[PDB]
Amino acid sequence: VGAXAXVXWXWXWXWX
Amino acid sequence: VGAXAXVXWXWXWXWX
């Protein structure tokens, strides 16, 4: 959960 | 995987 890969920002889910 | 919570930086596993 956060900024990088996963849930949040960058990659995986959420935004970028 | 990254900066926030999870594997990498901040919280969960790795560094901070």
Side-chain angles (χ1 to χ4, degrees), chain B residues 2-15:
Chain B
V7 192
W9 182 86
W11 300 301
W13 296 274
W15 302 281

Side-chain angles (χ1 to χ4, degrees), chain A residues 1-15:
Chain A
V1 182
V7 192
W9 182 86
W11 300 301
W13 296 274
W15 302 281

